Coordinates of C-alpha atoms and ligand atoms in Angstrom, one line a residue:
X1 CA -0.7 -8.5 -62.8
X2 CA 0.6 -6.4 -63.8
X3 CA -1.5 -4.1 -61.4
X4 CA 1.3 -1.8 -61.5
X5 CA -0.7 0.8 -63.5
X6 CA -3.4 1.1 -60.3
X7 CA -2.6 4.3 -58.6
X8 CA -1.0 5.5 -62.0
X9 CA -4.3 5.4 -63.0
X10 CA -6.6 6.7 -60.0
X11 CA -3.7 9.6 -59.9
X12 CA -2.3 8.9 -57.0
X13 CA 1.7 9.6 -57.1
X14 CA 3.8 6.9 -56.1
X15 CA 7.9 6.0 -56.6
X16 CA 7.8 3.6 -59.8
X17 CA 7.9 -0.4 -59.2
X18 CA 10.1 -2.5 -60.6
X19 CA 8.1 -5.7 -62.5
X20 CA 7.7 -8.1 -59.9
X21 CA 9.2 -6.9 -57.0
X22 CA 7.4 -3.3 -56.7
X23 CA 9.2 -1.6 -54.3
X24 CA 10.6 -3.7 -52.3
X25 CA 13.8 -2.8 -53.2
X26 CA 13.2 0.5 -51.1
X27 CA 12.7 -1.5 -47.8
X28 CA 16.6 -1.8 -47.6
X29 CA 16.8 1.2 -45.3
X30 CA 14.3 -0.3 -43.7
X31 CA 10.2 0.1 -43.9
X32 CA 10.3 3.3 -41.4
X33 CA 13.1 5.1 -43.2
X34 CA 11.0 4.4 -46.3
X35 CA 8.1 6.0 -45.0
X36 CA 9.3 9.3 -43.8
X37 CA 10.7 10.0 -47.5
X38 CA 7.4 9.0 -49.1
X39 CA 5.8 11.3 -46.8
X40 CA 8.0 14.1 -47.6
X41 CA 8.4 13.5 -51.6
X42 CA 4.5 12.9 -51.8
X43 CA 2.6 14.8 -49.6
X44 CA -1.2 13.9 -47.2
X45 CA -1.4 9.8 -50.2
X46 CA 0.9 8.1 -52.1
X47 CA 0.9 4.5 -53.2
X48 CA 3.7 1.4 -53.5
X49 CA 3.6 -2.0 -54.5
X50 CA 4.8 -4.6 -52.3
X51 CA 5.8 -7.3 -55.2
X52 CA 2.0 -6.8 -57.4
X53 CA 0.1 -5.7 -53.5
X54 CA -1.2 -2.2 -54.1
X55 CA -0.4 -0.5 -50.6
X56 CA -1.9 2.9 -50.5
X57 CA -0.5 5.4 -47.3
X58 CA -3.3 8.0 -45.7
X59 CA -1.8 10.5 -43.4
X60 CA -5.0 12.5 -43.1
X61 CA -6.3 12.7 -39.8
X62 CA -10.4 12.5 -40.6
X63 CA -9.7 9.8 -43.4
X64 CA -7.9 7.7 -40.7
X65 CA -10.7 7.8 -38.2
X66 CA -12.9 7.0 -41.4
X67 CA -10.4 4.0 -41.9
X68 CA -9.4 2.7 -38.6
X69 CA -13.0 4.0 -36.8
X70 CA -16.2 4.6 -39.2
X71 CA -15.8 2.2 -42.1
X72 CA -13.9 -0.7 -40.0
X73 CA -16.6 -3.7 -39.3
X74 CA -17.8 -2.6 -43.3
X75 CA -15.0 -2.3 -45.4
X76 CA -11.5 -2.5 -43.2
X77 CA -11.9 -5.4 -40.8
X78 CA -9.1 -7.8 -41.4
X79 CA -5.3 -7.1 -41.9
X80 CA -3.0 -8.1 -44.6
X81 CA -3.0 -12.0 -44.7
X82 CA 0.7 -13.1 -43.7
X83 CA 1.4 -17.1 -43.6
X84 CA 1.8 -19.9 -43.3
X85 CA 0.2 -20.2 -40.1
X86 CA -1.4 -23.4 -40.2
X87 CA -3.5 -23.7 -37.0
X88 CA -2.8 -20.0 -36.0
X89 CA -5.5 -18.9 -38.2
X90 CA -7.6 -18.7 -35.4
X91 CA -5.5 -16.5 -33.4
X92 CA -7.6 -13.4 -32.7
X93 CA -4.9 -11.2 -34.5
X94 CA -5.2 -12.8 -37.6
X95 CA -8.7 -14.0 -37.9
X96 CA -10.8 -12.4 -40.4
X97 CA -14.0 -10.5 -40.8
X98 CA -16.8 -12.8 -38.4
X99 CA -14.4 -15.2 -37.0
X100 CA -12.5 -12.2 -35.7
X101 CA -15.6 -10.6 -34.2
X102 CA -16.5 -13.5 -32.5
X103 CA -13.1 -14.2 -31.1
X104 CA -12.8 -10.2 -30.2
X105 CA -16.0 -10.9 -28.1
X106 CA -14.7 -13.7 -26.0
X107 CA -11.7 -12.4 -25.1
X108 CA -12.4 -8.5 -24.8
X109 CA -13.8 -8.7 -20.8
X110 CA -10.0 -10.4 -20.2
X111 CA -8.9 -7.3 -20.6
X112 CA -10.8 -4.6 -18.6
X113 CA -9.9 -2.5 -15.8
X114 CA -11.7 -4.8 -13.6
X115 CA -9.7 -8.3 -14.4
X116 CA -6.4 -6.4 -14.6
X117 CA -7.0 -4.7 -10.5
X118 CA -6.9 -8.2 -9.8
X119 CA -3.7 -8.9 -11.6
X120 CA -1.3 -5.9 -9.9
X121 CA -0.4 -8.2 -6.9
X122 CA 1.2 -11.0 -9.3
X123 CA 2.7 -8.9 -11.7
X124 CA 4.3 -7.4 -8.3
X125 CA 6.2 -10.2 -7.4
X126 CA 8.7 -10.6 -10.2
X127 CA 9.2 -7.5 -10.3
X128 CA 11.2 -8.2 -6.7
X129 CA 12.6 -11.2 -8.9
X130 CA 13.8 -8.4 -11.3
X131 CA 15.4 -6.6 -8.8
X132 CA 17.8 -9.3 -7.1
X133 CA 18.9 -10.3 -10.5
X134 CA 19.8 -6.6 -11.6
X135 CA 21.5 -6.4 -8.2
X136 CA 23.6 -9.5 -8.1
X137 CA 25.2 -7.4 -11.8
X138 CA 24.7 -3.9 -9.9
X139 CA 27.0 -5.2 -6.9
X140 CA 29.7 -6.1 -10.0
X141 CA 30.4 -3.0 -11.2
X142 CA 30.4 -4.3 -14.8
X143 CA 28.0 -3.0 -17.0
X144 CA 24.6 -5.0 -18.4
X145 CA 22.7 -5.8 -21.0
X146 CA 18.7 -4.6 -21.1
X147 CA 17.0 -7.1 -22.9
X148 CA 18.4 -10.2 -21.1
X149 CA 17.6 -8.9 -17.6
X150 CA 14.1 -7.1 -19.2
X151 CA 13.4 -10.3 -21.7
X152 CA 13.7 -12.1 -18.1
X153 CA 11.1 -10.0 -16.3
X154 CA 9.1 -10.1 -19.7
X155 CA 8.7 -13.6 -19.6
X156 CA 8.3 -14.3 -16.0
X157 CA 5.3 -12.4 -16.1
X158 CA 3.7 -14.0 -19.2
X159 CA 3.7 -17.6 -17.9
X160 CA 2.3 -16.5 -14.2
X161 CA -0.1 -13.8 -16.0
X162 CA -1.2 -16.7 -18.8
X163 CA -1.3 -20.1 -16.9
X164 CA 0.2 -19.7 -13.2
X165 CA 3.6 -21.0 -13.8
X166 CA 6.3 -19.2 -11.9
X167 CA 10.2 -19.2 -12.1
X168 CA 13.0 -17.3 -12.1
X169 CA 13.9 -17.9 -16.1
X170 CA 17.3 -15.7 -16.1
X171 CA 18.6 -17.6 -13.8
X172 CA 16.3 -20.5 -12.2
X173 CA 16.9 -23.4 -14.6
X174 CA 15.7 -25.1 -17.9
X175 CA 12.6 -25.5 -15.7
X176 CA 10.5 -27.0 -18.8
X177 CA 8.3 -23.9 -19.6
X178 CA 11.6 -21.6 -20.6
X179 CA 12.6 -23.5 -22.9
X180 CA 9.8 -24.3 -25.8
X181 CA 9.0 -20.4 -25.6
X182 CA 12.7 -19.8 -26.3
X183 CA 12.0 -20.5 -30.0
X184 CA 10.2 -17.4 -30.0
X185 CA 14.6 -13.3 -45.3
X186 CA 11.8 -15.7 -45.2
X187 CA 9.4 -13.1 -44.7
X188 CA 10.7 -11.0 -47.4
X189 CA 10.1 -13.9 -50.2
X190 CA 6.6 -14.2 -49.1
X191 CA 6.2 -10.7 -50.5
X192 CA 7.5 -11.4 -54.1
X193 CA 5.8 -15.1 -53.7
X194 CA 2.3 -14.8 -52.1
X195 CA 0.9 -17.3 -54.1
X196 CA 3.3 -20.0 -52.1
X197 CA 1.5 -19.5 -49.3
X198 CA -1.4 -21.8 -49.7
X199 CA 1.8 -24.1 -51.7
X200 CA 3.4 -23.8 -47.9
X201 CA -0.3 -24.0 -46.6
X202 CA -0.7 -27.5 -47.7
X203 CA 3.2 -28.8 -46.8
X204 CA 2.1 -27.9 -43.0
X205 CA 5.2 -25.8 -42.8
X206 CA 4.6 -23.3 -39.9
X207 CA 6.4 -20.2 -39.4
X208 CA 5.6 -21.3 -35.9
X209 CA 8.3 -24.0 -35.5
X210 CA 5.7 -26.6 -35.4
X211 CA 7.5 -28.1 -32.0
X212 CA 6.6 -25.5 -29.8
X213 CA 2.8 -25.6 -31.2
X214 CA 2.9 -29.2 -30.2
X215 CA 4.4 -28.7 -26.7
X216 CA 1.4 -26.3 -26.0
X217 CA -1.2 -28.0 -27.3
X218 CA -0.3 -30.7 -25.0
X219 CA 0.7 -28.7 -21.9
X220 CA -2.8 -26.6 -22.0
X221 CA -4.5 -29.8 -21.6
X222 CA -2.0 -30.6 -19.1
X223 CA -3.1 -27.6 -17.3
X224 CA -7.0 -27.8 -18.4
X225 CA -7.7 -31.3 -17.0
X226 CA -6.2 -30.9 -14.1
X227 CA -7.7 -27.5 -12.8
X228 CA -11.0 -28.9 -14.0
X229 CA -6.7 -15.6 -11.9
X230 CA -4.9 -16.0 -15.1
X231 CA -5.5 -15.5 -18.8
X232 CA -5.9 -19.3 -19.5
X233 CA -8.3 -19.9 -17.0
X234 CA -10.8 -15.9 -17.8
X235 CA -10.3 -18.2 -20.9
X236 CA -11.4 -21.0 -19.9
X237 CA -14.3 -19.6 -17.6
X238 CA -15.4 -18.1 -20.8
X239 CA -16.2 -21.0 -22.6
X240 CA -18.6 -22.4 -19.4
X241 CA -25.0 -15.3 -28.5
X242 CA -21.8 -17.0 -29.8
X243 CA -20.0 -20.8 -29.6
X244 CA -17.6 -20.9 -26.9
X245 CA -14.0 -21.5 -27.3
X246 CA -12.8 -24.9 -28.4
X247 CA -9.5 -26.2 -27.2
X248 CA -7.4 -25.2 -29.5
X249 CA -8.6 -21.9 -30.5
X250 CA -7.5 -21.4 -26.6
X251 CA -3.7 -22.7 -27.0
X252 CA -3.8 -20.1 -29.9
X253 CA -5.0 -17.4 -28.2
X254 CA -2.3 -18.1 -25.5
X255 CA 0.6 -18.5 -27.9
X256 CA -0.4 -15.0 -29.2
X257 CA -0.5 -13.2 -25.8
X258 CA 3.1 -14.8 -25.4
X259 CA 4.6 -13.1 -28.4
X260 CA 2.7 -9.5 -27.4
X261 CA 3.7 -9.3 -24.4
X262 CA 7.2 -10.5 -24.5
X263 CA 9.1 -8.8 -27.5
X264 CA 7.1 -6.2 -26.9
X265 CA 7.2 -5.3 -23.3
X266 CA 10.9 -6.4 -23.2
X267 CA 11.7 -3.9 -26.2
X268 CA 10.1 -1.2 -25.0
X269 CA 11.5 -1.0 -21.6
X270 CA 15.2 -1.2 -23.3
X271 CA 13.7 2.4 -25.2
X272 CA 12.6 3.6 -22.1
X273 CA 15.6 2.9 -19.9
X274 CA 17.8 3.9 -23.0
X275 CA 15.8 7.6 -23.1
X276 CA 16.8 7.7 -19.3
X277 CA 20.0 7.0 -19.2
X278 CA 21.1 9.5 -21.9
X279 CA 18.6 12.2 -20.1
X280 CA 19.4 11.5 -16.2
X281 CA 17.7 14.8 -15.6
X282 CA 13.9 13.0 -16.5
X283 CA 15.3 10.0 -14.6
X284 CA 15.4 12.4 -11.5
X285 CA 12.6 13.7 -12.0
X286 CA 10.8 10.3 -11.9
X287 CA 12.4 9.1 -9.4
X288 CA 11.4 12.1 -7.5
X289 CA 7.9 11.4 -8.4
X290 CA 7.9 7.9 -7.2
X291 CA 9.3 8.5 -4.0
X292 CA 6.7 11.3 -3.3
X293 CA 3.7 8.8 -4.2
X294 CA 5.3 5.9 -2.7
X295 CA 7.6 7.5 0.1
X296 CA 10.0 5.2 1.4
X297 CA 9.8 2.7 -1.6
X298 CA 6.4 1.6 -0.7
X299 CA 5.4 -1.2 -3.0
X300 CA 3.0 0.2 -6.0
X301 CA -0.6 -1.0 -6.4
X302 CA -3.4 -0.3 -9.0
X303 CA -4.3 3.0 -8.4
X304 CA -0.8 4.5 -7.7
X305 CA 0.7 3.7 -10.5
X306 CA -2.1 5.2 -12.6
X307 CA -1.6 8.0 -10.0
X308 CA 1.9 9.0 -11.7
X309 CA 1.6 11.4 -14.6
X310 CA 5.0 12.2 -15.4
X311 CA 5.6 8.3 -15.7
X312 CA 2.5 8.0 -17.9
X313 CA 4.3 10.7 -19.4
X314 CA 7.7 9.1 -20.0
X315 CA 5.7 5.9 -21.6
X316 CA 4.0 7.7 -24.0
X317 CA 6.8 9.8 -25.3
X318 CA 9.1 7.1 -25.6
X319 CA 6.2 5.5 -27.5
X320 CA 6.0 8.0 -30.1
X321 CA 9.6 7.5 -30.8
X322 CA 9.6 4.1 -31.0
X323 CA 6.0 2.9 -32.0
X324 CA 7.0 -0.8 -32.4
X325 CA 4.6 -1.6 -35.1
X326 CA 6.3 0.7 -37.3
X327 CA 2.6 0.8 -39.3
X328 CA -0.9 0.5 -38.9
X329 CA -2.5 -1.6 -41.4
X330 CA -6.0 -2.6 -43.0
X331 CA -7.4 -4.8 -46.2
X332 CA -9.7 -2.7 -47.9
X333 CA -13.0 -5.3 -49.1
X334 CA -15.4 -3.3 -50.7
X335 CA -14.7 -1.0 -53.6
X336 CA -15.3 2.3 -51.1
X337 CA -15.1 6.4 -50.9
X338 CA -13.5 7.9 -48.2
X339 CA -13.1 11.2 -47.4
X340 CA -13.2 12.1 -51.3
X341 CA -11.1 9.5 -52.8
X342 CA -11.9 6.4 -54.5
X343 CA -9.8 3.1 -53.0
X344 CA -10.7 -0.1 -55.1
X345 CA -11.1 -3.4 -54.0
X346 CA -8.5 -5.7 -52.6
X347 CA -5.8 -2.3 -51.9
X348 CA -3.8 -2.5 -48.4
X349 CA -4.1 0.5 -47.1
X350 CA -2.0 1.9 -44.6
X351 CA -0.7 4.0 -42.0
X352 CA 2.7 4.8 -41.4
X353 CA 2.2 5.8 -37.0
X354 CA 6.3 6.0 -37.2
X355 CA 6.1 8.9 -40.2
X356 CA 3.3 10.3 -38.3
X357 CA 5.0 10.1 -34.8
X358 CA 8.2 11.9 -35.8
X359 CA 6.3 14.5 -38.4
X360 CA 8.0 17.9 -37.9
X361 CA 4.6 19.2 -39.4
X362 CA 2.9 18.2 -35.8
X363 CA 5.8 17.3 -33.5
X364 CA 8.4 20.2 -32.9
X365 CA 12.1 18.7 -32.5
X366 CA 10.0 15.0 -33.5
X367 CA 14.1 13.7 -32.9
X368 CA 13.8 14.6 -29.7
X369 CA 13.4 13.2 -26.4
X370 CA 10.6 16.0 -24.5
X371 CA 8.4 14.1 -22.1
X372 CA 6.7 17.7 -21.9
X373 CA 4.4 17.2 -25.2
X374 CA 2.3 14.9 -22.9
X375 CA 2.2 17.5 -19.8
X376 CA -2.0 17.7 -18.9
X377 CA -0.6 21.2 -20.9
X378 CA 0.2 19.8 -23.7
X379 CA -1.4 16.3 -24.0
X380 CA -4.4 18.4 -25.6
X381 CA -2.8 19.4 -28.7
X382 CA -2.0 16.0 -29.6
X383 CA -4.2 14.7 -32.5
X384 CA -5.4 11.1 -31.2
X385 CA -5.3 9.9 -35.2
X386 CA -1.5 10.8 -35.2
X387 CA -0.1 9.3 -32.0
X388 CA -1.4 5.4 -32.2
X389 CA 1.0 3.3 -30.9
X390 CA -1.9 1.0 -30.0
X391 CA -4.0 1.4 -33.1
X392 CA -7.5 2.9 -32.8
X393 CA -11.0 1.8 -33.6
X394 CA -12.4 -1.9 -32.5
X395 CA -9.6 -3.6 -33.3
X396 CA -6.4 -1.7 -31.4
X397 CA -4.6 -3.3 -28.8
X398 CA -6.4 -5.5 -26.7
X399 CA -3.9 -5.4 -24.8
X400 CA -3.4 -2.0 -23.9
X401 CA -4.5 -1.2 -20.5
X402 CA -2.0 -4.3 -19.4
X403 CA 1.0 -3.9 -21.3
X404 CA 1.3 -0.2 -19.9
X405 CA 0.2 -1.9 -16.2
X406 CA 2.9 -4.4 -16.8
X407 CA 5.5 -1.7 -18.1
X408 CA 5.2 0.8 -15.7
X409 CA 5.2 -1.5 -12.4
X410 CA 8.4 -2.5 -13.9
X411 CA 9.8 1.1 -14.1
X412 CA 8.3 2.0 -10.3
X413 CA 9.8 -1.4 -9.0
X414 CA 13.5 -0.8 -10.6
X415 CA 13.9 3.0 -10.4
X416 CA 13.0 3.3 -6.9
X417 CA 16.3 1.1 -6.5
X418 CA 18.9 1.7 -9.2
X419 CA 19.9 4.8 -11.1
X420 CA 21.1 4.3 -15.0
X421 CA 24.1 5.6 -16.4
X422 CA 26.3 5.7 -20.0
X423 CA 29.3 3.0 -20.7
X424 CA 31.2 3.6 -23.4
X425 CA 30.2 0.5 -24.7
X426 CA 26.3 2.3 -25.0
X427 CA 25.4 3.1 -28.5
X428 CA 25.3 7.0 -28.9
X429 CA 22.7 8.1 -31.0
X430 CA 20.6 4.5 -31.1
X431 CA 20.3 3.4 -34.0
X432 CA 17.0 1.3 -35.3
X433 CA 17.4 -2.0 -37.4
X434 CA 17.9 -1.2 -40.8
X435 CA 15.9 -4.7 -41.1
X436 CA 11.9 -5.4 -40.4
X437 CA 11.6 -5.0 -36.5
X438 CA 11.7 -1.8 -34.4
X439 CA 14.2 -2.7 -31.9
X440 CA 17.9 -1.4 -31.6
X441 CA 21.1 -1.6 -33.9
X442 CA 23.0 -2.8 -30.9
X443 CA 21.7 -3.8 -27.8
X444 CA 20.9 -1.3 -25.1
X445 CA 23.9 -1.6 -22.9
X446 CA 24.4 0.6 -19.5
X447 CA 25.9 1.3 -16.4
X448 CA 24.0 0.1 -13.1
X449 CA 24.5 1.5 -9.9
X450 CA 22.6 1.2 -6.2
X451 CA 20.6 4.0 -4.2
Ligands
HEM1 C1 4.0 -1.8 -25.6 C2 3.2 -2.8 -25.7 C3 2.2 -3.0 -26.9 C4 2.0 -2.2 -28.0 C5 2.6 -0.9 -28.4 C6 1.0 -2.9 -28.9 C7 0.5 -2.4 -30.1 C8 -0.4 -2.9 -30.9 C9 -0.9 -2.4 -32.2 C10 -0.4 -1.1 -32.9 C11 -1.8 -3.3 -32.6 C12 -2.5 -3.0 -34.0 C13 -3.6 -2.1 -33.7 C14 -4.3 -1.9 -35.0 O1 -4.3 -2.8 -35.9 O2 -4.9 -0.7 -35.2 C15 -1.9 -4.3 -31.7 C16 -2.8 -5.4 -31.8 C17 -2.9 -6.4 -30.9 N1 -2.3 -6.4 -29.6 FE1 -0.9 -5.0 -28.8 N2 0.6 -4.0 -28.2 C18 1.3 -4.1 -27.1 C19 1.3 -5.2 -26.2 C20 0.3 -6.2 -26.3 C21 0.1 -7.1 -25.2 C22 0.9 -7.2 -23.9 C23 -0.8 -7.9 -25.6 C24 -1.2 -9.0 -24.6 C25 -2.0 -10.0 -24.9 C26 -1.3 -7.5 -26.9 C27 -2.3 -8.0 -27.7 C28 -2.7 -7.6 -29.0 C29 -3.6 -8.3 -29.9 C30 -4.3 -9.6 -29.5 C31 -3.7 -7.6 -31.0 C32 -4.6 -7.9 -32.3 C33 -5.9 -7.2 -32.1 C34 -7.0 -7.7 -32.9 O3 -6.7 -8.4 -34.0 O4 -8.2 -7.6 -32.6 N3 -0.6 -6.4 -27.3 N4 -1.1 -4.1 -30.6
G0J2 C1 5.8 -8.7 -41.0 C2 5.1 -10.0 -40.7 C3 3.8 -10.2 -41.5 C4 6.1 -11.1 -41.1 O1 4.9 -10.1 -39.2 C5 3.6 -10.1 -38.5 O2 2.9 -11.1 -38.7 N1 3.2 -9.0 -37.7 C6 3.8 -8.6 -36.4 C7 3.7 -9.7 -35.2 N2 2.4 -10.7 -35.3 C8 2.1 -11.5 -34.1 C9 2.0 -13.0 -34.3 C10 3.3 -13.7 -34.9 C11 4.5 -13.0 -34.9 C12 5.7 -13.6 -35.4 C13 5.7 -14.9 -36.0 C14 4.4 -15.6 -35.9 C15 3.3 -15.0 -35.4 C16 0.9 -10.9 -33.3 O3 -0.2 -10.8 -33.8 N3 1.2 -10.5 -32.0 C17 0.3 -9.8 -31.1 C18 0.9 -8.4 -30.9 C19 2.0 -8.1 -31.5 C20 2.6 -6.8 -31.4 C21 1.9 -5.9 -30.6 N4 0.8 -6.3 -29.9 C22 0.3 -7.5 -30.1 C23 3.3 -7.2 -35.8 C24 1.8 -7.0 -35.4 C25 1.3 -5.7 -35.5 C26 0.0 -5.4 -35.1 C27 -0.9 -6.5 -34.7 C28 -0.4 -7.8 -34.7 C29 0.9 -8.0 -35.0

């Protein structure tokens, strides 16, 4: 401080900070609204100041793949350090530099195309689950809400996919797994008080309500000694060139794949369903492509689903409209040239994948909803370092490959058996949260009727 002067003096234009809060004031409109003006005002770089952070923005293609691809296990390995976390610093999404690799290494084979074959036929059977539950509100003509019935689904596939537990969490009871992952503006003071991290660091706060972290800790041991297909036990046959993982390194892990694959998966499929109701034309057209593949709603396996393009197609569009990260982001640890341009040491830099995904300078009518952009036609044109809703370079989603799995046997599953229409109660445009998540204004709220 006051580091305010830093892109003032490496030239690099930038709306003015305030003293001590940078920018932040901008964020009110939220961080995506935020971006797309920056974008536009400044041109390919630009520069703000979270509090005294200097955050530089990149929107050139080659100087991305530099960033996110070339230069990442040099100079941009770890993320922007967020906390407290207390014992979550050894979750693989927020480890740093050689920690992180190692952790990378012992989870990656989790996740290949192998290991996730052999998950299709249990992330089958709630989607059945899912379909009773939607019918028991399909047969009462009264409209439903997305999130609850998805957030459902969501979850009963985490615990099963995770550690083998299995329920029916809408409605089967307060079996005791639902209820410790229920607890799924503090945020916002970290930015203009970083330095009260390690303060918070040593009072053993947690932004993860410290409970649930102790419920786990507890009931993975529960579940280790008494086993001794799932992601705690490829885990745990992992840790029978690096040292294996300890015990609670594991419970991290796990509490990390519950928040991906649960806000996550359960938001997106409110987008997706939301883009189909308001375009029942694409919703036919799916639906037509899922009955010719599967023909008389035969049940979907591995290799059909990655059999239907137009679905992949639906995904990945809806995707670029709602890329729930919002922005891609690295720490910048060396002082480094990249692409022609000097970045000093200690800068965030990052990239704004929701500016990119809705530029009109790549994306003709960005606002709106054209599955076509990602026909085997078109997907060609697309600029891989423009569209990442899963990141790029070594460390993107992990996750990838199985998120999509999960999400589109959810799609075959429900649209072979309902169709989606308007209420009036639906909101018309959608309208993001002016706040810090992508997810909707007002729940996603439709009409749900039988074939
Ligand atoms: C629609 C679903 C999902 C989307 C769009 C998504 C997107 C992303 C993005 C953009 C990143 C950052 C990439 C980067 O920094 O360049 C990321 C990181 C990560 N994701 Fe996903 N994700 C999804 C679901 C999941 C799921 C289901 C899991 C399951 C375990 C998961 C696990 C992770 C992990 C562990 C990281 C941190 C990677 C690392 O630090 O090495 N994600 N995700
Ligand atoms: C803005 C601040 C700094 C306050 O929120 C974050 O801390 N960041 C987000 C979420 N963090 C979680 C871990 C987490 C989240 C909330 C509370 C406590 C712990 C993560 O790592 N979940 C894996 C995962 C997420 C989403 C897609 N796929 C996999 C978003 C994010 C983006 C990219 C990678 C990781 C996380």
């Amino acid at each position: 401080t006051h580091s305010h002067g830093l892109f003032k003096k490496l030239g690099i234009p930038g709306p003015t900070p305030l003293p001590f809060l940078g920018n932040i004031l901008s964020y009110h409109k939220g961080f995506c609204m935020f971006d797309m003006e920056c974008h536009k005002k400044y041109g390919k770089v630009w520069g703000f100041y979270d509090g005294q952070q200097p955050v530089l923005a990149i929107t050139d293609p080659d100087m991305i793949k530099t960033v996110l691809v070339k230069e990442c296990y040099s100079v941009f390995t770890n993320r922007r350090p967020f906390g407290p976390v207390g014992f979550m610093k050894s979750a693989i999404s927020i480890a740093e530099d050689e920690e992180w690799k190692r952790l990378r290494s012992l989870l990656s084979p989790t996740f290949t195309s192998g290991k996730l074959k052999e998950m299709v036929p249990i992330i089958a059977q709630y989607g059945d689950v899912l379909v009773r539950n939607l019918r028991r509100e399909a047969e009462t003509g009264k409209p439903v809400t997305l999130k609850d019935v998805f957030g459902a689904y969501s979850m009963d596939v985490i615990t099963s996919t995770s550690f083998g537990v299995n329920i029916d969490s809408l409605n089967n009871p307060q079996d005791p797994f639902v209820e410790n992952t229920k607890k799924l503006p503090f945020f916002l003071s970290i930015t203009v008080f970083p330095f009260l991290i390690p303060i918070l660091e040593v009072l053993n706060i947690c932004v993860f309500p410290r409970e649930v972290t102790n419920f786990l800790r507890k009931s993975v041991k529960r579940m280790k000694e008494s086993r001794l297909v799932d992601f705690l036990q490829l885990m745990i046959d992992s840790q029978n060139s690096h040292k294996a993982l300890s015990d609670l390194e594991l419970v991290a892990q796990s509490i990390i794949f519950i928040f991906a694959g649960y806000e996550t998966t359960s938001s997106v499929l409110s987008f997706i369903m939301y883009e189909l109701a308001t375009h029942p034309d694409v919703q036919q057209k799916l639906q037509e492509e899922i009955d010719a593949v599967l023909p008389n709603k035969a049940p979907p396996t591995y290799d059909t689903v990655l059999q239907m393009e137009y679905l992949d197609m639906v995904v990945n569009e809806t995707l670029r409209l709602f890329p729930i990260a919002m922005r891609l982001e690295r720490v910048c640890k060396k002082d480094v040239e990249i692409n022609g341009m000097f970045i000093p040491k200690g800068v965030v830099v990052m990239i704004p994948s929701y500016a990119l995904h809705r530029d009109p300078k790549y994306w003709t009518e960005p606002e709106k909803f054209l599955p076509e952009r990602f026909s085997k036609k078109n997907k060609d044109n697309i600029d891989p370092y423009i569209y990442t809703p899963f990141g790029s370079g070594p460390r993107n989603c992990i996750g990838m490959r199985f998120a999509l799995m999960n999400m589109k046997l959810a799609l075959i599953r429900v649209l072979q058996n309902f169709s989606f229409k308007p209420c009036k109660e639906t909101q018309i445009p959608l309208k993001l949260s002016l706040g810090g998540l992508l997810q909707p204004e007002k729940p996603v709220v439709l009409k749900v009727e039988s074939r």
